[PDB]
Design a protein around this ligand. Structure first.
Ligand code: AKG
Ligand code: FE
Lengths: 428, 17
């Protein structure tokens, strides 16, 4: 890294002294030393960058968003000075973008990243990072255009290949996504050894019929991304008991299970009334998990938050459930009705986290044609009975009956989670 | 959001410290 311009070379002694304090952990001392350097040398880019790095370190020490916001501004000040070395320019704005993302100012990060690309149009890596910016805000279209530019200039870029294949796969171009994902992971370029790309490569292969999907699940297990070939959630807490099927007694949630089974007809009747008189409240499944068929969901709780308008449609069910914070407070799960019609097949898939168990309460179950596989075991629902499985394991669903199948889904915290984790885990 | 599956690039939100 070349960081000192002509003027900063003449004051390297004062700059190096200030930086030594930062490397020694005297954070409060180094900020005041760099502050005094900025006052004395208001045009020095190294001194201004030192002040931002110190404000950055201090923000970590105190876990302060306000301090980090000030560092984010000082990083930009560096770019407004005259005669800033290009290496210092990249570093100051790249770090600003990163910290803007860490704060959730995704729109601000994107503006910073766009400036970097305008300043250095030949840096492939900055374009790759701009593509990530677009993906973080969900703009897959602009992300796709970015990575196409990269693959035109550097067509062997592994980072660009996996992210291109991820976008294709997300746009349901399943067959087309596979070579981009396989060639990125195999390139070994930095950023390609990520569970997300193993997850979707094997899922894309499973959908098209290629039997080599297992090998990629195994490789992801060998490289520490998946807890097993079968349990492929990516937002995990280590050590939690891992088994596909659970009994009520094993979960310890026996009061909740008994309440569900004793009052099941009430839950059924409020769901049927919504189907009949408020059908619009059932929304189609929107995660591209279906091969074919009709599957819709009517959600009462999501991420630990009650849906007020939805509970107006099932008020007795919502009253009943409010007694059980183990599900209403589960910020990594949902409470919802789920209806599936004949001719529906749900692709093998896993949920995103191992921090929940998923209960199914049967409400209207045709006597033939409905079944659910989890790991190597297939089971069926019973009206008025609870089934419990860990949906972080691979599972698959078929609906080949002659009428609709309605169940009630109740997610609970994994029982071995401590209360501390239950309140601190980021919602999903 | 990632409800039944894992389809998003990231499933969580960033809110600082
Ligand atoms: O059978 C249903 O209603 C949904 C199946 C499923 O994939 C789940 O409950 O996670
Ligand atoms: Fe599922």
């Amino acid at each position: 890294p070349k960081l000192l311009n002509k003027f900063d070379k003449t004051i390297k002694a004062e700059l190096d002294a200030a930086e030594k304090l930062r490397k020694r952990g005297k954070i409060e001392e180094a900020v005041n030393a760099f502050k005094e350097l900025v006052r004395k040398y208001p045009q020095s880019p190294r001194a201004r960058y030192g002040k931002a790095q110190c404000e950055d370190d201090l923000a970590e020490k105190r876990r302060s968003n306000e301090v980090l916001r000030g560092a984010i501004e000082t990083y930009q000040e560096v770019a407004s000075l005259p005669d800033v070395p290009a290496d210092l320019l990249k570093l100051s704005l790249k770090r600003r973008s990163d910290r803007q993302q860490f704060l959730g100012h995704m729109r601000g990060s994107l503006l910073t990243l766009q400036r970097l690309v305008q300043l250095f149009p030949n840096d492939t890596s900055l374009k790759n990072d701009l593509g990530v910016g677009y993906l973080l805000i969900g703009d897959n279209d602009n992300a796709k255009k970015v990575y196409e530019e990269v693959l035109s200039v550097t067509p062997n870029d592994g980072f660009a290949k996996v992210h291109y294949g991820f976008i294709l796969k997300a746009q349901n171009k399943i067959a087309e996504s596979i070579p981009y994902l396989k060639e990125g992971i195999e390139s070994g370029d930095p950023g390609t050894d990520d569970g997300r790309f193993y997850f979707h490569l094997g899922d894309a292969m499973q959908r098209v019929g290629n039997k080599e999907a297992y090998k990629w699940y195994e490789l992801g297990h060998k490289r520490g991304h998946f807890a097993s070939v079968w349990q492929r959630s990516l937002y995990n807490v280590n050590g939690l008991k891992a088994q596909p099927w659970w009994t009520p007694k094993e979960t310890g949630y026996t009061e909740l299970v008994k309440s569900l089974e004793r009052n099941w007809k009430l839950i059924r009747d409020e769901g049927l009334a919504v189907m009949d008189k408020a059908k619009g409240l059932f929304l189609p499944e929107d995660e591209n998990l279906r091969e074919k068929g009709d599957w819709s969901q009517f959600t009462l709780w999501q991420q630990g938050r009650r849906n007020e308008n939805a509970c107006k449609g099932a008020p007795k069910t919502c009253t009943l459930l409010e007694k059980f914070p183990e599900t209403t407070g589960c910020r990594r799960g949902q409470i919802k009705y789920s209806i599936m019609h004949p001719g529906t097949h749900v692709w093998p898939h896993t949920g995103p986290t191992n921090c929940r168990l998923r209960m199914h309460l049967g409400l209207v179950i045709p006597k033939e044609g409905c079944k659910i596989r989890c790991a190597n075991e297939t089971k069926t629902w019973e009206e008025g009975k609870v089934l419990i499985f860990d949906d972080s394991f691979e599972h698959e669903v078929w609906q080949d009956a002659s009428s609709f199948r309605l169940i009630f889904i109740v997610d609970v915290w994994h029982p071995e989670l401590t209360p501390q984790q239950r309140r601190s885990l980021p919602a999903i | 959001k990632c409800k039944d599956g894992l389809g998003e690039y990231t499933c969580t939100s960033l809110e600082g410290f």
